[PDB]
Design a binder for this molecule. Structure first.
Ligand SMILES: [Ca+2]
Ligand SMILES: [Ca+2]
Ligand SMILES: [Ca+2]
Ligand SMILES: [Ca+2]
Ligand SMILES: [Mn+2]
Ligand SMILES: [Mn+2]
Ligand SMILES: [Mn+2]
Ligand SMILES: [Mn+2]
Lengths: 237, 237, 237, 237
C-alpha cells in the first residue's frame, strides 16, 4: 500500500462518503475523507492557481487557491509529516473524471524543497519549474491517461480532438527524481509548491477534481480509483 | 516614533522589565517586553545561526536559533503584520552592550521577500545575500557604532584594537532598499531571513543581545537605547 | 560626467551621427555611437523581450531581443567592464522621443548579480524582479517623465490620457540600491538582465528608443539628451 | 559509445596520448585528447573549487578552477552543444586512479539549468544543491566504486578504512533526473555547475583526475577506463 498526503481541489460533492455539499479544497492524510476542508468558489473555464506550503517549525500544511480579482480559498492542518511519510518521497499531480467530466489541464508547475541540516551554510535544495510541457518530457513519470505537448500543456485526463473532456479517466504526473522530504539532523525543513490549472466542462457540470500529492517513491494508480477517489486511494475509507 | 517588529536574542536577564531569569529568544511587537519567549542556552564563543520565517497564509512569525550538534530554541507568535507595519519597510540587525558586554559579530546575512498579486501571478521578489562584508559596503546603512570590513565581518557594537568588547555601545545595519512587506492585493506574501553570529564575552555575564528587526523606512537609533533596550526602543514600556 | 555602458534598442535611424540605416540594437560604451550594432526587425504594437548577460571569465556583453514566433537579433562585444565602470554602480532603463514618437512601456524587469570571492561558497548576491509596478514604487528612482502604476506598468516617456505617446519626452527608472558589479578579490562575477517591452507608434513612425544601462551611483538625465541621445549622453560625440 | 562532453581536472601528464607536461584543466568533446587545455597548479591536500558555465548566445564552454588566496586556472572553448549532445542528457562527476592514486573527494555540488522557449518570457528551470551527502542518497545514481555518507562527503574512487586511496579505481555519480539541455524553440539556454573537491596523495605523484561531464541518459562506465581514461572513454583516440 502507498502512503499519500494530498491537497484535493474537489469539483463534485460526494456526500455519500463525507464530502461537504459544494466544491471545496481539502487536506487528505492517508484517506479520501479530508481532515479539513474549505468552500471553493470554482470558476468553470477560468485559469486558477494553487499555492501549497509547509515547514518543520510550525508543522502546518497550508494551501491557497485563487482566480485573478476573485477571492481566494484557504485551508490549513497541523500535521508532523515526519510521523506520516517516508524520508524519501516523490511529488506529483493527479486528476480524474467519472460519470461527469472536466478538463484537468496543467499550464505550469513549480516546486522547491530545502533542508538545513544543523550546520551553518550546509543546505540541500531541490527546485524545478515547468512553464511549458513538451511531447517527450523525460523528467516526468506519466501514469494513466496523462499526456504532454497538447498546446505545450499537460493534460492529466483524456480529452478528445475537439478539446472535449471524456468520462472515466485517470492520470498522474510525478517528477522523475526522489525528494528528501525530512531528516532527523535537519534544523529546518520546508517545501513550497505552485501550479496553474484550467478546469472546464461544456455541460457546466464538472467532476471530479485535481490533487497535488506526495507519495512513496513507487506509488502507482490504484485499481478502481477512477472518479471520486481522485486516482489516489484504493477505497473510500 | 518608529514601528518596530523584532526577534531578540537576549543574553542578559533584566527581570525588572519582564525578562525571564535566563538568556532567551523572544518576539517583540512594538514593545521591549517580549510577547512570547523561549529559553536559550547561549554558548559563549561559538558561532550560532538564526532563521526567521513568516507568511500571510498562516500569519505566524517563527524563529529558531541553534549551534551545530546542540539543541535548538524555537519561539512562535501569531501576528498579522498587516495591522502592525507600514506597507514599505526597511529590515536590519541591531545590537547593544551596557554595563556588561560581549561581541555582536555578524558573519553572514541573507533575506528573501516575495509578494504574489491579486491579478494572480504578478510575483515580485527581492533577495540579498551577504557571506562577506567589504570595508565600503555601499548597500547598507550603518547606524551608531556599526562598522564592516572588520575581518570581512560586520561588527554591530564597538570592539577594541585588541579585539575586546566595549560597554555602553549601540549599532545597527539596514539594507539600503525599502521592502514591500505586504499589499492589499497579494494572494501570498512571505519573508525569510538567516544570519550567523559570534557572541564572545570576557566578563561574568554577557549583555545585552542581538536582534533582527523590521521598521519604518526612516528609523533611527532611539536616544539612550544602549543596554537593555537593544538599540530599538526608547523606553521599557 | 557619467560613465554609461548601455544596450540600446534604437527605433530611429540617425545616419548623420553614425546610426546604421534601419532600426537596430547596439552596445554603447561611453558614447551614443555603438561599438557594435545588429539589425532588428522591430514589430510595432507587439511585446518584446530583451536578455542581457555578462561574466568576468568570458568578458563579453551580449544581448538578445526577440518577439514570440519571430526571429531574434543578437549582438555581443568583448569588453572588460573593470576598465570602464566603477566598482559600485546603479542599473536602470532609459527612453526618449523627439520629433517622432512611440510608447516606451515596460511590463517586467528582473536583475541578478553574483560575486564569488576567495572563500568557498562565499558568494554575495542580489536579485530583484518586478512583474507589476505600483503607483508608489518606493524601490525605484524615477527621473524625467517616468511614472509607474499606470495599468500596473512602468511608462518611461510621456503618454496622454487617450493613450497617445508624446514627442520631446525623456525618462529613467533606476533600482534604489547600489550594485557591487565587480570586485578585485573575485574569482567570478556576472549579471543577467531581462525586461519585456511594448513600443507602439500610432503613426507607424517610431522614435527614439529604450536602453538598458549601467551607471555611476548619482547619474541624472543630461541636459539636452532628448531624442537621439536616449537620455544617456549629453552630445553625439 | 556514449556521447561525452567533459571538463577534466587532470593531475597526471600522459604525454603519450597528448597531455601537456604538467597537471591541467581541459575541455573534452567526444575524446580524451582535450580540444583546449590550461596549466593548473594543483595543491595536494587542499580543498579547491571548480566552476563551469555555458550559454547558447555566445556558445562557449568555460571553466575556472581555484584555491583560496591562490591564482586560478581558466579554459574556454567555442562549442555549439546543439551539434554535439542529444536534447536530453544526464550530468555527473567522474574520477579514476591507476598505478598512481589520490583521493577524489567531493564536498559539495550544485547545478542550475535554464531554458527560455517560444513565448514572451517562458522559462523552464532545474536546480539542485548538495552541501552534504547521506548514506543513502536516493537522487544520485552511483556507478563503480563511488560511495556517499563518508563523513557526509562523496568519495568517487575507493578509499581504505584508515583513509588511504586505492589504485585501479573508477566511480561516477549522475544526478537522477534527465536534463533538457537544449531546445530549438529556445531564445536562450544556459547552465552553471559548481563543486568543491579534495585530492590528497601519499604517492610521489597523484593520479588520475576528476571530471565534470554531460552524457546520454543511459551512460555507464566503459570497461577498463581506470587510470588515464578518467572513467569516461573506451580508448585514447
Ligand atoms: Ca468529491
Ligand atoms: Ca535583557
Ligand atoms: Ca537612433
Ligand atoms: Ca592524464
Ligand atoms: Mn472531498
Ligand atoms: Mn528580553
Ligand atoms: Mn543607434
Ligand atoms: Mn589530460
Amino acid at each position: 500500500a502507498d502512503t499519500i498526503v494530498a491537497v484535493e481541489l474537489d469539483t463534485y460533492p460526494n456526500t455519500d462518503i463525507g464530502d461537504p455539499s459544494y466544491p471545496h479544497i481539502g487536506i487528505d492524510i492517508k484517506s479520501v475523507r479530508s481532515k479539513k476542508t474549505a468552500k471553493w468558489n470554482m470558476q468553470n473555464g477560468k485559469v486558477g492557481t494553487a499555492h501549497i506550503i509547509y515547514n518543520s517549525v510550525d508543522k502546518r500544511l497550508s494551501a491557497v487557491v485563487s482566480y485573478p480579482n476573485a477571492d481566494s480559498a484557504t485551508v490549513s492542518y497541523d500535521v508532523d509529516l515526519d510521523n506520516v511519510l517516508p524520508e524519501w518521497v516523490r511529488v506529483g499531480l493527479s486528476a480524474s473524471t467519472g460519470l461527469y467530466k472536466e478538463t484537468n489541464t496543467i499550464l505550469s508547475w513549480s516546486f522547491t524543497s530545502k533542508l538545513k541540516s544543523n550546520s551553518t551554510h550546509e543546505t540541500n535544495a531541490l527546485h524545478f519549474m515547468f512553464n511549458q510541457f513538451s511531447k517527450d518530457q523525460k523528467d516526468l513519470i506519466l501514469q494513466g491517461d496523462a499526456t504532454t505537448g497538447t498546446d505545450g500543456n499537460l493534460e492529466l485526463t483524456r480529452v478528445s480532438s475537439n478539446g472535449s473532456p471524456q468520462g472515466s479517466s485517470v492520470g498522474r504526473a510525478l517528477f522523475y527524481a526522489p525528494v528528501h522530504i525530512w531528516e532527523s539532523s535537519a534544523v529546518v525543513a520546508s517545501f513550497e509548491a505552485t501550479f496553474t490549472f484550467l478546469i472546464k466542462s461544456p455541460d457546466s457540470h464538472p467532476a471530479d477534481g485535481i490533487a497535488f500529492f506526495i507519495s512513496n517513491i513507487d506509488s502507482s494508480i490504484p485499481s478502481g480509483s477512477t472518479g471520486r477517489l481522485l486516482g489516489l486511494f484504493p477505497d473510500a475509507n
